[PDB]
Amino acid sequence: LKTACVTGGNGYIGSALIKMLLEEGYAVKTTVRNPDDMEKNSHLKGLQELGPLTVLRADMDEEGSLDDAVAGCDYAFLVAAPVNLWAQDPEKQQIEPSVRGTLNAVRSCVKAGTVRRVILTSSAAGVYIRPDLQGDGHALDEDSWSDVDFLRANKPPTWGYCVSKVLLEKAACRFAEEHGISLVTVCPVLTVGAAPAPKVRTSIVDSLSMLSGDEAGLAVLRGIETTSGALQLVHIDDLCRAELFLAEEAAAGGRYICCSLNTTVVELARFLAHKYPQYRVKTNFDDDEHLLERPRVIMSSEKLVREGFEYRHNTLDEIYDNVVEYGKALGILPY
Amino acid sequence: LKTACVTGGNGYIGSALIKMLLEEGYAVKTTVRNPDDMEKNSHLKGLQELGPLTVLRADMDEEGSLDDAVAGCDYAFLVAAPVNLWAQDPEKQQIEPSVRGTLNAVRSCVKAGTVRRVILTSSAAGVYIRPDLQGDGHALDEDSWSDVDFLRANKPPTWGYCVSKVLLEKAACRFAEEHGISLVTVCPVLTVGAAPAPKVRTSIVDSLSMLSGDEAGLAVLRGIETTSGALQLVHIDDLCRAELFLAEEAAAGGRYICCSLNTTVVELARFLAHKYPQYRVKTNFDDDEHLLERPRVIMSSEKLVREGFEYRHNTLDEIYDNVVEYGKALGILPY
Ligand SMILES: NC(=O)c1ccc[n+]([C@@H]2O[C@H](COP(=O)([O-])OP(=O)(O)OC[C@H]3O[C@@H](n4cnc5c(N)ncnc54)[C@H](OP(=O)(O)O)[C@@H]3O)[C@@H](O)[C@H]2O)c1
Ligand SMILES: NC(=O)c1ccc[n+]([C@@H]2O[C@H](COP(=O)([O-])OP(=O)(O)OC[C@H]3O[C@@H](n4cnc5c(N)ncnc54)[C@H](OP(=O)(O)O)[C@@H]3O)[C@@H](O)[C@H]2O)c1
Ligand SMILES: O=C1C[C@@H](c2ccc(O)cc2)Oc2cc(O)cc(O)c21
Ligand SMILES: O=C1C[C@@H](c2ccc(O)cc2)Oc2cc(O)cc(O)c21
């Protein structure tokens, strides 16, 4: 069989990727940091009783820890990454560990000799910090990079996360090219949908905040719109198929935005209020709230599409098709 | 004042639209075919003594008939249309007059020069004839068009009505684009609620059939579900507000489904049986329970809700809040 490595099998996106790879007939090796924690990793046993899944222990911050897991793999999906969006000391707790851990992982992939392609999962946060674009009508593509200097000078919330994505991508791209290994980078927007992982929180807390009523989650969604010009969404299923697509399509190369739809907080609030009447969805925003009626800047996925990929969740109704039941199971929603 | 034209002021939806436009401060001009029939048109005098309403005589089948009425209007609400759902000769009694009357109306709107936007009332019957979708889990949006080929090949009941909506929509859009006039099309599902018109019947006969026991109306409801995959409902007041919203919302464009709730014959029957025990509502079926237990195909109003519209009647109780009294006043219900 063809074998794939997925770092961070207990993560939100990582757990979904593993499930899809197995379904598509791959043998899968995944790393977690504490396999003995079956609260976090029970889905890996569930999947492991269904398909050829291997679970290993590794911390990406330790050089060479990934050597064994990626040995004998055709593809390496580097999903695991530091996600301290709000660290007190971002340079040391988010940025430096991100760059160092990504280089550690690519080094292991090179060492393995068998890895045909590395698939690095980054984020739209490395793309859409663009304070030089004013007014509306803007459309960002893979040539757009988040303004690191602006981020370090002004340090808005989650600035360290945005910087870490920019720096780790460039470090990864340089390392891969200097060692002759093919590297594809995927920059997904906010990802929504059910996954096998039983104890994840991550962005689900935020994407469900209009239904849960959590004001911190609501601030995150507002922050995305304010800082990037829109609220961009993609379904977990489309993200995982996109990663498989980019791994398999030999003609694929370089960076790829993964984004199905550009909306706004107000649009999403209205739609969710309409689709889920049982929740008290606040839709009446009033003035000061610098909220957009329509996107000012959109993220373009034309490169991935013209590459041959097709999204299957193309409306708000389809992007939010199964996340509510997932939120219930995770305890993020009560009922 | 801003001035709006409404065709067919004696019609069910037309009469409700006129009352709402007058309430919202519009000067209104409406056309009827026989203003001297004050049994059908008395509500227009009642409205005329309360607000700035002009009543004119016109038959949409005759080219130019609408010229005078729509002259000086900022918006034109084309509500009047042939409703011979069961014509013996649909081609000549339903389809051709529909296309021709709509083109006549839009031509008059262009000639007026003042019409900023045309709001064309069409029907969900132009959307949900989709024999290619089997199983459940389907959601239809504005890109779904009723299958005219299937309709002409099998000629199910009301096939001529369904075809007329598809053709008049496409002909109208091609004409509007060539003349650079904004045309927005609304495709309501089964519309329910009280209206000023005193002698209308239309779908009220069918939407009240579970209370009246009329088996022809009950057959129409079962037919909607069997042919479209659900029993879709919207309140007259939400439809009228939606039409105003789309007229006034500069960003709005193209076609819009108007649908508050996707339910079933059985669920509606159980709801009506509990709400109105004085009437004898049949809730026990079987075999004939080819009736769905839950919608197989749902009409998605996501485009309209994203545009900025919010439904105010969202439950069966809210959708059926005042239709029964109206049915009494119309003689459709005895008591
Ligand atoms: N969720 C979204 O909506 C979204 C959208 C766009 C981009 N992204 C990005 O895609 C990546 C995955 O996101 P996610 O939502 O799945 O986050 P998550 O649920 O919190 O999972 C993060 C994974 O990374 C692991 N990890 C972190 N540091 C590690 C380390 N030093 N060594 C080994 N493993 C480490 C974590 O393992 P531990 O449990 O041991 O910490 C976990 O498995 C993230 O980089 C995210 O920023 C997410
Ligand atoms: N009622 C619903 O539940 C529903 C749901 C979805 C869509 N719709 C569609 O919305 C439209 C209005 O529906 P409705 O319930 O209000 O029907 P309605 O009560 O029977 O009224 C029909 C109106 O159209 C007029 N009309 C027909 N042909 C005309 C012509 N050649 N020239 C001038 N006027 C003409 C009629 O005037 P006359 O009296 O002189 O014939 C009448 O005013 C219809 O196209 C319907 O198919 C209705
Ligand atoms: O790691 C991520 C991804 C990030 C994100 C949001 C929007 C976007 O467009 C790209 C990335 O959002 C989050 C929000 C959280 O509460 C926790 C998280 O771990 C994350
Ligand atoms: O003109 C219409 C609208 C049509 C309709 C029903 C459901 C739907 O979803 C869309 C349209 O139903 C009707 C039923 C009638 O007895 C008489 C009518 O004149 C009509």
Side-chain angles (χ1 to χ4, degrees), chain A residues 261-264 267 270-271 273-274 277 283-284 293-294 314-318, chain B residues 139 141 249 251 259-261 298 300-302 305-311 314:
Chain A
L261 167 161
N262 294 269
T263 183
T264 59
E267 264 172 50
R270 293 198 270 276
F271 175 77
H274 168 69
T283 81
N284 195 332
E293 310 164 68
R294 291 145 223 109
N314 299 293
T315 69
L316 292 183
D317 193 51
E318 284 165 350
Chain B
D141 74 12
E249 179 50 83
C259 169
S260 172
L261 173 67
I298 58 101
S300 176
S301 184
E302 151 174 351
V305 165
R306 285 183 60 170
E307 200 70 61
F309 178 80
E310 294 163 289
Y311 295 85
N314 298 293

Side-chain angles (χ1 to χ4, degrees), chain A residues 83 85-86 123-125 128 161 188-190 202-203 206 220 224 232:
Chain A
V83 286
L85 309 209
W86 301 271
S123 153
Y128 60 26
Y161 175 74
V189 295
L190 181 53
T202 183
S203 94
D206 302 321
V220 176
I224 292 168
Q232 316 84 355

Side-chain angles (χ1 to χ4, degrees), chain A residues 99-129:
Chain A
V99 171
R100 203 172 58 242
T102 291
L103 290 177
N104 281 344
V106 182
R107 192 178 304 113
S108 295
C109 294
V110 172
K111 180 153 176 73
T114 56
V115 176
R116 186 170 336 183
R117 184 166 279 176
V118 175
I119 306 304
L120 173 56
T121 297
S122 181
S123 153
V127 166
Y128 60 26
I129 303 305

Side-chain angles (χ1 to χ4, degrees), chain B residues 7-14 31-34 40 58-61 79-83 85 121-124 161 165 187-192 200-204 239:
Chain B
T7 60
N10 72 293
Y12 170 47
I13 293 167
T31 62
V32 294
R33 288 207 277 189
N34 187 196
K40 281 158 64 232
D59 184 319
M60 310 288 95
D61 282 340
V79 180
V83 288
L85 272 50
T121 301
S122 175
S123 165
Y161 174 69
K165 288 323 182 186
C187 300
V189 299
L190 181 63
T191 300
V192 182
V200 298
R201 324 237 325 154
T202 188
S203 68
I204 311 166
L239 168 54

